[PDB]
Subunit: 105 residues, 3 copies
């Protein structure tokens, strides 16, 4: 049981690295989603006020196949990005995994 | 060979965490790239139609050194973001690594 | 000390996966921040030149609680995204951790 504790200590360091990287990348992405969402907000305001471009329409579903490529608005009110949350049960199934490992020992 | 199986089980859990985090972060980024690309699209349409701002030019290469800081367009047709795909050979070199580990045993 | 070297080799492969994923995700995000920042730049230029929309004001702090939801500019000069750098001391505390592991052995 002494060699398995060193095993766990290696395992746990990496598990912590994974946990921290998720936490930081998520923070970083959520900050991105906030700016991209607010750009969208303001860009839809200008599209409703600027008279030169009120004549231009929004693309309709044919939009999900101009990404495989188009003079129409791609950004609409559905263009908003949803909050991004990664799976966080790392500290859970890991506790489970090794508890099943100790009930044989 | 019984202590090495517990080693592998710890190793494999973390490997799976890494694989899932990559998969989710990538999904999350690719969704970002789609909104940022379509903003760019529409913003370049407004730049070609709004008459008040047709007089403003696009910055020319001196643009890659206003990021170290500028009344000209930074976003042009080269501003699009490329599809982001992370390395995925995790399930490959890991199989290789431990197969070389078992042919001595 | 022969079973601990296989332990370390498993540990080190995953540590490398973590290091590479951080490196790639960061590259990917920093590219995003550059496009989102330059969109912001240009969008603030159009907000200062287009006469149809000079009458529209910027939201004032009541902005950090329209994200819980608003006809005012959400994107201002504070909207820029800061350079994102993830913790990179992985190759450091890992060397520390196992050096303390070898001074007992």
């Amino acid at each position: 049981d002494e060699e398995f504790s060193d095993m766990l200590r290696l395992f746990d360091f990496n598990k912590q690295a994974i946990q921290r990287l998720k936490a930081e990348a998520q923070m970083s992405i959520q900050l991105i989603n906030k700016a991209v969402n607010a750009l969208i907000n303001d860009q839809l305001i200008m599209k409703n006020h600027l008279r030169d471009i009120m004549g231009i329409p929004y693309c309709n579903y044919s939009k999900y196949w101009y990404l495989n490529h188009p003079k129409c608005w791609l950004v609409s009110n559905g263009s908003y990005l949803n909050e991004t949350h990664f799976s966080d049960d790392i500290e859970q199934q890991a506790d489970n995994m090794i508890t099943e490992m100790l009930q044989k020992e």
